[PDB]
Amino acid sequence: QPLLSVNNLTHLYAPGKGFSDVSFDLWPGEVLGIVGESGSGKTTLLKSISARLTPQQGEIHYENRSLYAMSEADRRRLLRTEWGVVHQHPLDGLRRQVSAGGNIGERLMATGARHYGDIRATAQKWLEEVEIPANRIDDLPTTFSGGMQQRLQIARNLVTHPKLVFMDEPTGGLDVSVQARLLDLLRGLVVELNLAVVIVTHDLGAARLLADRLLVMKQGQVVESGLTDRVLDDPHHPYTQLLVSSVL
Amino acid sequence: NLSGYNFAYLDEQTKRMIRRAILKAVAIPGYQVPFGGREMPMPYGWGTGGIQLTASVIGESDVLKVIDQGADDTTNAVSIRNFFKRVTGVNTTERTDDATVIQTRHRIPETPLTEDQIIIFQVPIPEPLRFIEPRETETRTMHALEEYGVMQVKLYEDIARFGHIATTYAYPVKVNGRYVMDPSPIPKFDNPKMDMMPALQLFGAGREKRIYAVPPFTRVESLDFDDHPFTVQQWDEPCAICGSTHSYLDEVVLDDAGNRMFVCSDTDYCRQQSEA
Amino acid sequence: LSGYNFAYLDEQTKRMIRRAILKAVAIPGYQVPFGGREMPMPYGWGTGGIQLTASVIGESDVLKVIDQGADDTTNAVSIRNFFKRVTGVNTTERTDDATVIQTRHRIPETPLTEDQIIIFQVPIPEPLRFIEPRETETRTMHALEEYGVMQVKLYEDIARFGHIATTYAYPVKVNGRYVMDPSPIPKFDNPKMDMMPALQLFGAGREKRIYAVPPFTRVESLDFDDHPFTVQQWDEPCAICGSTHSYLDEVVLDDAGNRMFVCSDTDYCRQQSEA
Amino acid sequence: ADTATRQHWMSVLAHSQPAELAARLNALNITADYEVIRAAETGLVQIQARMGGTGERFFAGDATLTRAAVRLTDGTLGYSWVQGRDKQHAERCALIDALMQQSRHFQNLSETLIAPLDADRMARIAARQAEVNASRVDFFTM
Amino acid sequence: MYVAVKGGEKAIDAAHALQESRRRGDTDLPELSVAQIEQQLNLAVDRVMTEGGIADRELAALALKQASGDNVEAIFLLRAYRTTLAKLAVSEPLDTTGMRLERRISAVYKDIPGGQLLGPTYDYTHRLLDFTLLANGEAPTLTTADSEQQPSPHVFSLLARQGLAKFEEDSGAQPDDITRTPPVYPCSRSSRLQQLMRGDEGYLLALAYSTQRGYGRNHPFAGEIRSGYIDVSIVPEELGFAVNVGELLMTECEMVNGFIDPPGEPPHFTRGYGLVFGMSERKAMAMALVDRALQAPEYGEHATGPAQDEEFVLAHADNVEVAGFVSHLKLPHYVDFQAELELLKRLQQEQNH
Amino acid sequence: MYVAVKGGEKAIDAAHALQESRRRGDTDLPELSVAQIEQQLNLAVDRVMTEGGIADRELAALALKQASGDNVEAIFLLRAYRTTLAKLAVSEPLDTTGMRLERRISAVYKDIPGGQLLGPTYDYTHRLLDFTLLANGEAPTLTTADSEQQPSPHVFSLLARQGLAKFEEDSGAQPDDITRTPPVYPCSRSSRLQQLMRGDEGYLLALAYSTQRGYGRNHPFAGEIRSGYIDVSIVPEELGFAVNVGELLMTECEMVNGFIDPPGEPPHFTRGYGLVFGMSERKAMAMALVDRALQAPEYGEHATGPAQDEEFVLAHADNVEVAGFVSHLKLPHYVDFQAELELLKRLQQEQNH
Amino acid sequence: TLETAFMLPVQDAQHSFRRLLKAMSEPGVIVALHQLKRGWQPNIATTSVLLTLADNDTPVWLSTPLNNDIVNQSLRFHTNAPLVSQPEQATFAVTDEAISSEQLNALSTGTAVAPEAGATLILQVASLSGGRMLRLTGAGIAEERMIAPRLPECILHELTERPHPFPLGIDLILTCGERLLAIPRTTHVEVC
Ligand SMILES: [Zn+2]
Ligand SMILES: [Zn+2]
Ligand SMILES: [Zn+2]
Ligand SMILES: [Zn+2]
């Protein structure tokens, strides 16, 4: 049955701002993208679904368990053992004073690794997995580049083999070459690991490259369910045409 | 007691409050129980929490032993002992075995403690996560959820940066298998003495308003990795007086030429060994 | 004859302040750092203005010290008495008779003429300080002339209230290049700074900055076409002189709520009343 | 005597300076055998203020307070709570509180002791207020 | 061979004798009495009473004398003495509206009902050292005026009557006492105010200065500074009615701050409050500014500067705690340093055999 | 019909007369001498000298007397007096090794060469208010010992000779003088130290406390605290040789901080330095801790806590500036507040329905 | 009318607290509180515990069998504690072997973020030896302690199952005559 069922989620902190009557389901291994204007409230949807913002009304059902029915400890554990969150700003999801190896192995240690050699070996393996050179494992995030910081964030979140990762436009602020290479790496990871990805972006190019199914939101509600190369090339509802033409 | 102050200098209300806190802490080993500490004659940072704890537990028939840095004659130790003789009149002893209540600062006596003995610790920072997470609003929740990952992360970072754990005193210890607790800033040489000890251990942070405890015969395990096991301080030299190799030594600089001697930190233990 | 050096300041301090003044005049709007000393008045009570006046004042000068536009305000009285003690110069309450004017939060209603110098007392000599508290950052902003953040704040104010929340110390562009804040004067007084015939000096002793506007310089308040620069307005005239073109201040007469509006510029009020 | 008048003389006694009260009582040379049920005790009164002057309450420190109680032979109880630390003053105030509750002493003391003390305090207040009003700033007239 | 000896007790005895001798100073000069200190060093006594928690002038002056004039040591002495005393009663809430004014100023209006009473202040004085104080002087003769006290309503009462400010309404909430229980962040405004009142004057002044300089701007105006005598009243158990126990010299400061625009309601000024013992105003102004800064959560303001950080501001505000823990480093710490030395020597031996 | 009267100067004069009369206090008590303050309130005098910038005990005591004991006002009086005086010479660098010790304590070793000289101190005293000081008594006679000062090397000399720390090398860089030019951030360590020494004791203490509680820890140890007399020497133009002009009572604190591991040399302890006038240790200790905290850029450390932020720490350290600006709000601001009221009244009327 | 209290309140309170601390820190150890010569009927141990711990800050709830008027007056006069009517508000819950399951479940067990906020249950039992044998292990016990108190079924269920996981829970203080026994929330109990 779908791994993340969203049923009529609404939250409007300020008049209009926020989202309302949002419903959909997610199956394992499929990438669902979210596209909309900055005021669309898509980002608020991302916080609400990513066990961070309590909705005013609606229901989330991770696996067959209401998300917010879980105790604070249960959802806190979920956000660090089986779920992943990739913030736009790496320093938000990365511990700045902790070396890259420590950032990657913090999840393992929170699970109780209790073996330095194994933790360091796993950290090096994951640094290789994301193309970061392994020679600078002991380095710290501030000494990395933006693309390298992003790669480190994905490695940190994927160290535990999460079955569902949310991604709040991690490519923002990256060059076209770096963005494309990072997206290619993300495609490789997504196909290699059967983990669902919920990617929120403000541009259609990233969704085209990465997403499998696409959703469009306007002013805090779902506009039309989509699909790669269908909504992108065949925008039905007029705002969809406006968006694609604005990109074009 | 003829100083005009209530026995132990504390009003009965404060003593009752501290006693309730002590009982709650004993019922929840390793948990920092907030308590309404007052201002003692000795300044905050100078052992007011331990002073209040011992004032709440000390009685007429108890034999008090106050040691600072493991020495009875340390200036702060003698000051606290004089205060308690003035406001309590109890007997004071420098021998660990004779003492019934031991108030220690930064050291655990070398002589093992028997039952019915209470050792009271003066802790400046009762939170083991304080230096990783300075905010109490965060560390309180971290303790509630048993989210002690950052401690292991800090140990891992120390190993990566230096090749060894950089914490040498106030070493965090998991007590009873659930709560990670910060002992007094005792050297990691002393953590093994805290495991399954026959005596009740009380830790009081007067400045930080916290009381916690370890009941007798409780599991206390210092955090570490399997491939980097917990170790203790080592010295090549024995005690320069008693010639003991099983005691925490301290360094005394005899002259500017660089001549130095290492002597037992526990003065009572050194005295006992030398007279043998 | 007070036992201190004339104007209370030693010669080298006067020279340093004078070099700072010349540099500031050569760079209209730039905040020139200067090593100000501690004056008998506390920091924030007008030490910068006092130091500037001491550096520029001479024996033949006629000094007018006004606070809130009034000559009899407590701080104005204290500063004027200090200057009378340490210099003995002549003091006046009439704007047209004063060669040097030291003002705290007003530009006199009476227009200033040539050869007059007006010293402004500035608490915060930085229009971007409440946006970017770091001096290390505002300094480079001024160096590169990156004032977009000021426009951002103005637009945010318009969005939140529909109006520029700033009402005094309103930033102004000088000589088309430097955004500076004037003294904490109302928006009412900003127009008076444009193409003024009198040199304007601004001094912040606590923040240790001197800047200036030469005579006949363009001083344009920041605004937008959709939101033209407005000025404080009242529906009442001065309760004493009856003037409708002066910055009024409110005086509460009794707890019942009775109040009267009177000209802030007491000299201008006196001139109008005697007419 | 209603509680208003008792409050009045208790306030007058509390605000009176210890020295002047002692001098007044010695001059009056009043004889009244009594026993101190509660010896003058010094402690704290927790000062409680309102945020904003009229809003929620909050604790604003403490002030030293000396309290005493006295029982006369007949049975009347006098109490005193005086801010400060003078035990003798508190005991004297309690004694006068006890005395004022007796018709034999109320009329005499209210005119010979309480009224002069209140007048002296009011005179001091008026003098101080007169010398302080010289610092008022004048702006307008008529 | 060496043998340990006892020298701690005699060493501390000698040190305390030396400190007492130094405090007495030159025996030729007469020992200054506590009355002289509480009369002529009144501004130091004001800070000592405010931060020590006891509003007794003689006790504060005695602490200052015993502390060799050290404000921190005197504050700690008074605070420690506080523990000894018992709480005989809790006063009725103070009514500042009925204080015998000795000073009343407002920066928001040129003139206000009751006038601008400057009172005894150092403001507008030229801070030039008065060397005539090196020799005994003559008591100045004070001029006088009419002795009547004009009605002096609070400026915020006037503002609220116009609708510009919001009245401070009492909900009957029980105040939080930190002396009874340790603070638990986030703290309610009552406990925040209690902690600020007994906070370091210098620390609070620095935080308020930072807010004024842009680190958490709040746009403050000195709405009302008001120093005078407030009557203190209690309600004993023996007598069911209220009894006036005396009066305290209190300084009350109320700041007008940047107005807000709540939804629905019209915009209004926000306000800050401060209250101290004695005639020292600057502490009250700093308390008001920091209080307004810490009110940020109620108005949903993003903390821009540390002055808006409740944890950081209130954790380090207390003189006794702060001073005690900085000075604790003077205590022997050679066991911990021996541990550090052992580790460092191991590291040095490893890197450079 | 109203008319504007002129009543500012008379009010100012009356207020100042009232303040002077209040400072004199009751005329029955003899006016306390400046010598009495200098001798018996020596710790307040020490703080005033340190933060005022002049190491003259009599001048600091005079400032305290003129300020009615207010430390901030006295500090400002002394700082303002500094301006009038002319700089006659610049002393040769102080050699603290020649200090004639009155107090020397090391917290890092049980015993040191020269011993633990406690000297006069309030440490280890039970802070119980001594009510025998209400009535003057007589100080006890001081016991004596051998009158020779055995060599007292600095503890960091011992540590550096072991290689555990690094000697502070003199590169000949010209010290920065904030008193001559306004501070410019980032600041050299000389300017930072000069600013810290003039900084407020309470603010620096709070910052050091915050660092000790985890807000950017530096793991401090009181390596050595020395109080004693240091000789002062100058080289006049008209004489080609140095001349000894006197001696100052100064306190020096040197703090061992957390060790680092430089890439190309063995790990070693970092150090902090504090130096003040008089025998007020805690100011020197806070100075040393904040000095180490502000050394973050030199060691490439991330600014975790506010105490590590150089601009924030130093822009608000100056007691004189902080106090003056916080106090400026007592000045009339009714023009700015009238502008704010005009804006607010319009905003309210726009949304009035 | 009012019941008497400790003859020497300070010394007796200290001695009783030390005995109670010995009992609590070493679960299963029976201690005697001999300082009070007569409890406020209905025992001595319970009265000593209330006199040495309860005060104005600790609401006390007395079960109906023990909720006598004289004892209420004595608690108000001596301890000054507030006597609440519902177990939910009780910091100290005093009851006997008649305690019902609902009453036991109503007690405050604290919160995971502040487990000390819970309530302490003082249970009066017919005897401390003779009931179902129980084995105790955990903090305070070297190897294992065997105690056979005669206490209700609901309490046995609470101890053996611990429905509220650590740190949540209620510390139990069994009393009988002048003798006392303590079982903290961290003790693992198992029938025989
Ligand atoms: Zn320590
Ligand atoms: Zn030995
Ligand atoms: Zn201003
Ligand atoms: Zn007019």
Author numbering:
A (entry chain I): 3 to 250
B (entry chain D): 3 to 278
C (entry chain H): 4 to 278
D (entry chain A): 3 to 144
E (entry chain C), F (entry chain G): 1 to 353
G (entry chain B): 2 to 43, 45 to 194
Task: Please give sentences taken from the publication describing this entry.
In Escherichia coli, the 14-cistron phn operon encoding carbon-phosphorus lyase allows for utilisation of phosphorus from a wide range of stable phosphonate compounds containing a C-P bond. The crystal structure of a core enzyme complex, Phn(GHIJ)2, revealed a symmetrical hetero-octamer consisting of a compact, central tetramer of the PhnI and PhnG subunits each interacting individually with the more distal PhnJ and PhnH subunits. Here, we show using single-particle cryogenic electron microscopy that PhnJ mediates binding of a double dimer of the ATP-binding cassette proteins, PhnK and PhnL, to the core complex. ATP hydrolysis induces drastic structural remodelling leading to opening of the core complex and reconfiguration of a metal-binding and putative active site located at the interface between the PhnI and PhnJ subunits.
An initial map generated using 901,800 particles resulted in a structure with an overall resolution of 2.2 Å (using the gold standard Fourier shell correlation (FSC) 0.143 cut-off criterion) of the C–P lyase core complex bound to a single PhnK subunit as previously observed. PhnK displayed a significantly lower resolution than the core PhnGHIJ complex, so we used 3D classification with signal subtraction to focus the refinement on PhnK and obtained a final class consisting of 50,323 particles at a resolution of 2.6 Å. This map had improved density for PhnK and allowed for tracing of the complete fold of the protein. Variability analysis revealed several distinct positions of PhnK representing a hinge-like motion of the ABC domain around the site of interaction. The specific interaction of PhnK with the CID of PhnJ is driven primarily by electrostatic interactions involving negatively charged residues on PhnJ (Glu149, Asp226, Asp228, and Asp229) and a positive patch on PhnK (Arg78, Arg82, and Arg116). These interactions are further stabilised by hydrophobic interaction between PhnJ Tyr158 and PhnK Tyr118. In a subset of 3D classes, additional EM density was visible near the P-loop of PhnK. The density overlaps partially with that of ATP inside NBD modules in ABC transporters, but the lack of high-resolution features suggests that any nucleotide binding is disordered and consequently that PhnK is not in a catalytically competent state. In summary, we conclude that when a single PhnK subunit binds to the C–P lyase core complex, it is structurally disordered and cannot engage in ATP hydrolysis. Moreover, and in contrast to previous observations, we observe no significant structural changes in the PhnGHIJ core complex, including the putative Fe4S4 cluster site, upon binding of a single subunit PhnK (rmsd = 0.5 Å).
